[PDB]
Symmetry: D2
């Protein structure tokens, strides 16, 4: 079938890539337009690029991650096992939908790890609105809405909770909240189920640094930033049994 | 067919009498379909553990005589569909003993250090050393779980959350630090290392267990049913409690 | 004696400034922004920080005074309505001086020369884009290899600021120390960090040494500039201290209570 | 000079203890367990804490030494394989002395005072609710499991597990950390750990219940009808015997980070 392979850039990834492509020279044809199997070689950062490269056809693509360096949560296959990889089950992980409104039109984005909103320099002040209901007035560095699979990324470093990627939900964590009598925040991470909409509304400044995984751009004149669990899912190709918690253990505990 | 529990104070007992007077409703504490709690969340917990054997045929209603609770959302000046929340199944192994929790289930030592092996799905995850561990229900996240640094999750999510209690987290006993949220059919097994005497607590019930071989945690198939008359959002209840 | 007054910029602060200057004009007070002995900041903590760095070359000859036109600050503890009593007490010289410790930041390059900075609140170091990875060396001894957003070294008085939002502890400004806090540490198998904030005494040096990237985004009291080809970043408690003019007694813990709990 | 040795209890501690006593049998060392000048602890930090309270009324005439039979401790810095060197070094009388600050715990109901090397915690006997007073000034009303006041050297103990900051023992201060605070509309607490210098008094005053489970280090007691719990940096200090540079941060490193040569 149709497939394609992306590379990190280093010699180890490109050499391993060419080594695998020649292996398919079976009934496998290389195609980067309409692939059925996308293979990422490098790390989680490399895998994220492959996700956004083919986010228009997530329903017809199974992803496979290979790490040339340290173990990743997406790139979970060693280069020494590249021979065996060249008949599988499909595992689906939830994604995050980020919608931005302006003063025009609106923009939507898909996240595999998380989406963060920070200030354009000074203090980040927004009103956190949960399901058309005011919850808190936040003041700090920013806010982080994480995917289940993305909880082991930025979310964890921010003191968030680790969620199993079988749970369809999203998690909101604080970034250096001042948390005083004027700007009282919840402090605890908040996990939202499906059909729940978290709305971030400006108070004074209208310019925000919205980031989606590995892409941070400046959005001017922002009226609203809404978060909710996307209906679209990312599909993986399961060959062996590598449990999520086991993958967490090998990463942080060892 | 229904029944009514009371906290113990005069305000709760007298209000209870008024509700009986209001009720083709036959008062039956044997096989009730409607259980009404009067007092607070603590009183509500007592009503839950009173009928664990018939949680599938009972809809609960909470009335707070004191401050607002997460389970008692009805003011006493209002005595005049079903919503299901997940539960936590706690199994202690020696003949095994099982317990159901509405808020959470914590395991501490019987005096000295608390040292166990955290096993996730028959696979060792970490060796814990500290005060103890806390496995919380979705609805119980706004309780002890929050104080321990745990995350707040909406009760519509069927899962369980494990949080640390003063982990030493060093070379020998490296822990994850972050709270862990486990879905359905996931089993967290806590296995002793040396001392096998632990102070296992289920919600408001803290009992001492001797000769413990294994403590297993998993989301129970049984769910607690509430009676929804109005619409009080979970996040609004969190807002009114911690954000004033 | 010689004095000067800085203003936030709004009408209220500027108005208060002119009236105080006229107030001092009734006594033996000379206005001088070049070599003053008393620097009065009118506005907020941010305004106070600007006045600090404006005269960081003569901190030994200056007693600072903060006046908050808005909400109460940790550096600006005087209300505008007390400006009249402030002038009269300043003119007589009826006040004692209280000293707060400062943080010394030293940046080394691939010999550029060598840059030094003084911080009243804190000094932070982050990357210039990607992952921030450095080796934390405490007193010429390797302590940890850090990977994350960055690191924040705070002064005692600066603990109630960015430090607190990062989970740092609150120290009384009488304690001569500095506090290092983590900024979103990945803290895994490869990059194991302490997690806990670290309080260092005087004469202790925390050296941050690069692993791959030499470019770092260093900020001193929100003066964030890009430093290229960085060889070393050293942290130590400065021998220089900031001097305040004390007329009454506003306890640090009360200022903490009035700011984060209730007022 | 006069010395004594405490033991954990196991075979390793008792055997190593006998070897040292016999080791001092070639030098001018008098063994005395009632009025010693050098107290040696064999076992762990728990053993050291026991040796501290055993001779806490003569802290001015005693320099302590710790030997860890198991993992590295913050008070037991010496290895069992270095016991041979310790005897000769102690006999030669060649060592500088290092002093660590202590925590003074006062319980009023007559007045009871306690000295802590690590920390002093106060819990309930149900909900623990007290009013935290800092220098005769109300700061917050706490509600949770309890409160922990830690010594500088004690910051690496329970204080670290509670999320407190690590302080160098050269700093004469004390640190207050929360224990499972509820922090809501009614009971708003600071959250952050608080570090107090000398001459600063932290007063814990009851709200409803007067009974509290007050613990000082290993000693966990129960005080009834408590009116006030006072915390302040004690004037008394514990003295150590230094032979070689073993930095505090190294002990922190070798305990929480990694120990590659072990
Ligand atoms: N604005 N201003 N003045 C700079 C002061 O801001 C304090 N400081 C900072 S400065 C670092 C920064 O760029 N943060 C992005 C958001 C932000 C900038 N300035 C803030 C001031 C208050 C609150 C948020 C910000 N962040 C924080 C922080 N999250 N919570 C508390 N306090 C901070 C820090 O003490 C610094 O000295
Ligand atoms: N009782 N007692 N033990 C004395 C030392 O134990 C230290 N201490 C304590 S005492 C409070 C307590 O009952 N903890 C329950 C579990 C436990 C007891 N002792 C431990 C020692 C190490 C680890 C866990 C325990 N907890 C802790 C704590 N989580 N992490 C570190 N160290 C602690 C505390 O500093 C005290 O100095
Ligand atoms: N036992 N009991 N009561 C039942 C509920 O009390 C809730 N729960 C507890 S019970 C554990 C305990 O023994 N804590 C000592 C102090 C305490 C006891 N009950 C409390 C209730 C509120 C606040 C403090 C206590 N602690 C906590 C906690 N620190 N912050 C929040 N909520 C808690 C917990 O959810 C439990 O299910
Ligand atoms: N790897 N990679 N690509 C970007 C991903 O990196 C993850 N991500 C980030 S991105 C936010 C950021 O700019 N942080 C500054 C330093 C940094 C950039 N990328 C990093 C990757 C690992 C560690 C630090 C950085 N920070 C973090 C974080 N502290 N700990 C864990 N993971 C993070 C985040 O999930 C993002 O999706």
């Amino acid at each position: 079938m149709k497939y394609m392979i992306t590379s990190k850039g280093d010699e180890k990834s490109d050499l391993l890539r060419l080594n695998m492509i020649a292996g398919f020279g079976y009934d496998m044809e290389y195609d980067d337009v309409e692939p059925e199997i996308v293979i990422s070689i490098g790390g989680d950062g490399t895998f994220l690029s492959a996700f956004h490269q083919y986010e228009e056809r997530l329903d017809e693509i199974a992803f496979i991650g290979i790490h040339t360096g340290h173990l990743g949560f997406y790139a979970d296959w060693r280069p020494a096992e590249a021979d065996k990889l060249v008949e599988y089950q499909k595992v689906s992980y939830p994604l995050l939908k980020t919608t931005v409104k302006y003063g025009k039109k609106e923009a939507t984005y898909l996240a595999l790890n998380e989406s963060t909103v920070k200030s354009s320099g000074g203090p980040f002040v927004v009103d956190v609105v949960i399901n058309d209901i005011h919850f808190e007035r936040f003041r700090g560095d920013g806010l982080c809405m994480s995917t289940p699979s993305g909880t082991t990324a930025y979310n964890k470093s921010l003191g968030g909770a680790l969620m199993h990627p079988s749970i369809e939900a999203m998690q909101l964590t604080e970034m250096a909240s001042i948390n005083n009598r004027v700007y009282r925040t919840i402090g605890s991470p908040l996990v939202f189920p499906k059909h729940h909409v978290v709305s971030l509304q400006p108070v004074n400044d209208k310019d925000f640094q919205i980031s989606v995984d590995h892409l941070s751009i400046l959005h001017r004149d922002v009226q609203e930033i809404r978060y909710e669990v996307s209906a679209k899912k990312i599909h993986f190709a399961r060959f062996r049994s590598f449990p999520f918690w086991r993958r967490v253990h090998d990463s942080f505990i060892e």
